[model samples]
Target chain A: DRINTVRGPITISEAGFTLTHEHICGSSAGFLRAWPEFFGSRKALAEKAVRGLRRARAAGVRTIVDVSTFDIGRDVSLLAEVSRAADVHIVAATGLWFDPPLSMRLRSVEELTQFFLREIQYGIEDTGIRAGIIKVATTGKATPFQELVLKAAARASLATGVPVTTHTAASQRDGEQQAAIFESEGLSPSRVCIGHSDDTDDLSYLTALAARGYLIGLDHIPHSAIGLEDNASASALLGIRSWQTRALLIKALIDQGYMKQILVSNDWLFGFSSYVTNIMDVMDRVNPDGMAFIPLRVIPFLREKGVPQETLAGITVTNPARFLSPTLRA
Target chain B: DRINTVRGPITISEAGFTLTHEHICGSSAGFLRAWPEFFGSRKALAEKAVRGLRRARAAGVRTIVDVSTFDIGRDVSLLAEVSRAADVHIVAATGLWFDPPLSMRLRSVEELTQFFLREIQYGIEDTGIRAGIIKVATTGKATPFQELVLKAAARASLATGVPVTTHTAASQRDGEQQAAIFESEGLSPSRVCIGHSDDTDDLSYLTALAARGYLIGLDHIPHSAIGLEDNASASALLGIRSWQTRALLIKALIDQGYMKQILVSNDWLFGFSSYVTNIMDVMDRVNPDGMAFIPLRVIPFLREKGVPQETLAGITVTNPARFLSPTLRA
Candidate 1:
């Protein structure tokens, strides 16, 4: 029952299995870097991290790729403990983030690429944590810093045989620019995924990126950060319809031969203190009871709307499995 | 060229058409009857009424019918003055409303019939204020009181040549009770327009009511009062889809020989400070900038949904005209 470990250019047996993008532990680089005083304490954070992993595992989650990169709290010890406890495959990463203020110090593209290469080749070898994929991000509005990050991440993926996934901002231009950077780096376009590709009205950009053999992360279901909060709450009936619209887009992508290139998740950050205890409290202050945050309320609606069980399973389970499989990375 | 006031079954040709299913200078009978002390001064109420009518006229509304019956205030002088000043047709009415609780003191069917006939025949002459049509209500769940209201409204319509329209509660039984009442009263179903029929999911009930040669009022547009808020909101995008659904139902009725009876209106009551200044204000508190009242925002949407200019005009004009025409009442 041992699984082979490989990076990028991997393939899976099923089109609807494996999660291409997810996080096992640690906060986003920007948040962690900015609020290091709060998040840097492992003892204070470890209990919540364990609870979150258990929640994911209980919900049948198999594998999660921890994409916290350099300068973030990429503590291998915490990830390893949770991985072993949860019985879920823990894929860690090495790359750079896109935000300028945090990444301003990581000046050279070559140096950043070398940093990623070291992690991919040696597993943060001294730290005893294996690096499985290359992770990077692009500002929703592309900047030179994001361009360098993409270039470094792409170059490292090409060199170390690791797959690349990006934390794209809420715009199509971010994905487009990331694609251009990877193409410029002479990397196989299929080795990369354009994350948060679902946040835009620009279907043409997504289609273009998908056409270039790139995975498109349509993950982040139930994430209110995307938009339509009032509409989501006033009418659960309409919320379901909106979910169906996303599902329809995913199906259209699959129909257009892009199923293997699609990944879905709740984009959950349960380990973050703000999200764990404060988000709902803030929601109550803003919109009491946070009626919109009731999870799985939309699932029955999808079922009522005739979304097939297999497609539901594909979006939730099988697809993530395939996307995260070592064989699919190549 | 003089417009023929009584021409061809009250056919309306142009825009600025006012719907008679409106409230202008008074509150609902239940509200007024229950809390007489809560009634505001006439001068203040008339001023508020004038403001509302003027606002409607500014938006190209030309006519309106105040349909509050029973103990509901029907101040003919105020309506006349408001209509005269605003250049809007303010149609007043005379009939009984639904039974106890939400209705006035119960009356015999014969007594209610006489009351309606006297208003249509002599009230207009005596007060120099026209009685446009008859109004009545039914408990959405059918009761004996609903039958009596239907009988009384029907008798008045037959005797004085006024068209009959009724408020049916938003219920599955509404259509059935309406049809049954009309049949039992031996009224020509063509003269009756059933109001608030969109509240039910029972298509067969609606189709049956349409089949009976009655008009369906899909007038309460933009409100999810009828359970299709999302469809209505989405339709409001290009046109009020809720209205469109009603129009489709009317079209189906037309196919079944009930085309001449469809009527649409906003059923808006500007006089109720609770609804106008308060409900919207509270809704704004809940969703600032009036998101809860999305219908107000859906007007542009309805226009964009390929709702034809002529059809829009018809729903707002021709159909209502035909439904209210004296000749059609024959």
Candidate 2:
């Protein structure tokens, strides 16, 4: 009955073109707990988060799902404050991480079930604000532990009737492995979005995941900061994957009639490790309009490539609405 | 300083011959979330858990750390009740999987750091029951994602001063990889317990982990649930390695003056499937290893190995005490 927001619930009809994967204030949540002083003041961090969300909103972004899970230093309390100031709906997430904290891996499936269900039904940190999305993830190689998490996430999805989103090591082509577990758990493909597909150019891998009825996350668009490291692999190993490559992949998927299964976001994180400031510095020198990359630059580039307007609408609007809506039949 | 337990806080010295790596109750916790109707009754399951813990408690077990992370379907609520009935201390763990949930692998270190910290500071799900131990793990090879979880765990351990324990595909000699992360994070070796060390016969890895002052988990004894399938690897893969292989490894570690760094437990779960039981039935027809293997057999087997009584105390009692106690450094 509610499309849960960080502040409160919103109507499904009120949900709009949304970013499926993003972090308003992320990058090692552990650091905040360990060394809160390092993040400076919490108020200042919240202010910065609000500004970034406002900037994205100014770019016509309506809603975004904060894919920052517990381990990544997600300031859920701060996130709520920032969401209110930003003038946009931020669907705060709950679940484990792509590299689950060690404790998460050892949990009995039921322990995790209780952990996630409490968050979805109750709320995270006792905020009385239930999570709208159940976030899960996989490493470059999906381990048995990752498979366990996928199965648990599927179960959580069934319990909460919320859409499941994920972080994938796209280059590893592990989406199918994740999909297999989700399907084994009896989840509909329409309920899960496999993220970070833009990390690789393998259309076969992307298409295969979409073919299985799982949505492909083509979010890493117009990316300038390829690696968090200032070292060699940042460029050489997995270089700055441009908007054109992403658009082409999107176009290819659309041409192959898988347009409806695509969910795109910038995969951007605020307060990131060597974060937005560093990216902005990098972006200023490289892709200055990376801010407007998705709505303005990429969408226009997508249209110029002869992508049908309806296909763009589905990728941008319709699919997102359906994906973000809670399927609480019970 | 108090040792966080399923029941509540206890003194450090009160934490006794603790089974560092064990689950009081486990099954596909995901099943409960996906579909609880098939699990039969929760009350019966809890009663069975109380009986198992009571049986183990009678076997000279005083304390146990349930290393069940979220994905395992950890029922902390049930575990708490079971701990109450069993009259033994159960140190509740908080963190991700060694294999990690799909969601955990994708997060930045900070997110996981806060997740673990919250359990320690606030409590897991507001039961006011703080987690005393920090759990983390790795599969066959410590992948980059696994490494991220390790770092986040290290940070959490550093923040809380709670002991960090882990899971390892011991055959791969991955303890060194995990130790390296703990070391790199500047966590004292005394603060870590490298789990499932018995899975390997490699003394080099065992000694090295102990040499760095890390406790080695000789916890997988009393296991007969060997390879469920001959065709392929069971996802827990290096399944059901024997007691003798583990004994030799333990004796070697003790021989090298590292007895103080060895911890033992059965790592048994109450609700593991008949897949292991199926093999056990076949095993019963072939090999007559009793249902009670360790306390009745392996302990005597240690005597058969000519291990000194004092060394056994360190393995069972002293090591676990230190591993579970909070580092109340003021």
Candidate 3:
């Protein structure tokens, strides 16, 4: 029996690794800023994202959770088609993105809760596509508006038995605030993965979040800005190795007994021209192969440092799967 | 008297019209092939181009010449600075770039010379900054080499030299071939602007020696691919209109009737990354005000329609001063 209230019946193997947060098909607001005209048309943009999904699957990616929300052109139909083409189980979400000036005028919390609940159920029941999670975003500097969205998302998850994930502005305080709001909604702290938590190198804060049973996401690695030093040295400020370190933090949580909560992904946006470069760009800078290196490199380093493979597996696979699975109707 | 043979002194206006050919800074042959490690050394890669010149300036370029040669980067130091900070001359190049697959081998050439040269010297010269003309390319495709280079470039110009220029492949073809083997030898064509013409474009064919009647170039656009594209564009299109387009074109030629025969400048390079997305890339796709439009939109249309009085003076004035000044002597 699955003891977790959020994750329902799900089994895990030693080889089972599910990426709880991944984009199978969708463009981001950042992409729109760069190429507004190209991304303005939803149908065309969705088609492009679908192609990326097919490419991702052929490369062996298993499961993906498309966290693109309502305001950002979230289309269940497109997601459904992408899931079919890629032959990968895709878990989509229902919520609003947090771009303050844009989404600030949204309806009240209770109204938002109803809308989100409908989307969650509609995604799961009406369409064959599963609604495994609820996603929402908060700015780097949280305003009252972000707090409202977080509350609504948490309430929707509580009502429908779905898990919750969040995008945090590049501030740890935003992550802490999100955690606080989710907890206040009576949701288990273990169910939340604070996105972009690695923007700050404050390990103590990340450790604090982990200690509280919230999964920490250090994804979005390999970008030129975040990892490099002024002199252009490669440092793992928030790489897969960083995830392993978080695992050690999680192990500490497990040692104190909080093992079933930790997740990781690349937060990679494959279609942006800025993200795409000459073949050398990929090999020399982006380092797509780094994904494989995570298990090979980080696992060895963590093992040498006294972390066990079981703990690695839990953080890398089992925990993520458990996080995304449907919640039991207690 | 002008030290370099071929044409009379050239003069460019202060408003400075266009740069038919140029590069940003430096490049790696293998890095630009859409390879994985291409962006690995980007900061270093970007710095090399950025250090060369300020992007925005007083010069009003409508377009630029970004002829990407193998192993060179498209260093748009001056282009970017100018576009962001002020207005200046700039027009970029595209199509089958060069031969011998530096470290990256790609193939394509069809109406390529016409396409590239027109953008470089005449047709699409005036983009956002000021491109008064278009450029001609002939390297990998030309065989017997010099004769073929001349024939292809000459044909492209005859088809569309509204304002024309051609790049003669150096190292592969000797200087004597510029006049003899290609122009006087193969086509007996006189009104063509031979590039790097002072070097390989200046070579003799049959009994004729280098023609002292065509334009002679001394500007070593740059040491690398990117560097070359930047410098060539700046030098070629600088201050063209104020000097009376017809007179300037005539003065460059020693033989009066061979008015179109005079053209000169260094054959530089353009790196692959520069083409992916930079200020140059942005300029390539957008209109002057930064709105989305077809490539080389503003300048070409304006030139065909005619510039306002104030704008015309600079294209005729400052642009010629930079191109014809003694400082450009070989």
Model 2 gets an lDDT of 0.70
Q: Which should have the higher DockQ, number 2 or number 3?
A: 2
Instruction: Identify the runs in model 1 with alpha carbons over 4 angstroms from their true place.
Output: A1-18, A24-44, A99-104, A225-248, A255-257, A273-307, A311-330, B1-330
- Which CAPRI quality tier does the interface of model 1 achieve? incorrect
What are the models' TM-scores? Answer: 0.41, 0.55, 0.41
Model 1 lDDT per residue over A1-330, tens place: 122232222234322223445554434322232222343344545555566656555555555666655433355556776666655556677775542222223246775665577667655634535576777876666576667778887787776566788887645368777777788888876678777666655777888888787878875444442244554432321122344455456656766666656766544442442223234233223322111221233345555666565666665555544444443244
- C-alpha lDDT values of all predictions: 0.54, 0.70, 0.44
Candidate 2, residues A273-325, lDDT tens digits: the string is 42322333454344444334578777878899898777787788788888877
Taking the tens digit of each residue's C-alpha lDDT, what string does model 1 give over B293-323?
2123223444565445555566566666666
What lDDT tens digits, residue by residue, belong to model 3 across residues B153-263?
A: 445434433233455544355334444544443333233334543332222321132244444332232222222345443324221222123222222233323222233
> Which of the two, 1 or 2, has more DockQ?
2
For each candidate, what is chain B's TM-score?
0.73, 0.87, 0.41
Enumerate the candidates' DockQ scores in order: 0.00, 0.06, 0.01
Candidate 3 lDDT by residue in tens digits, A109-160: 7756765776665433234344567788877665666677888888888776
Could you tell me the lDDT of residue A134 within candidate 2? 79
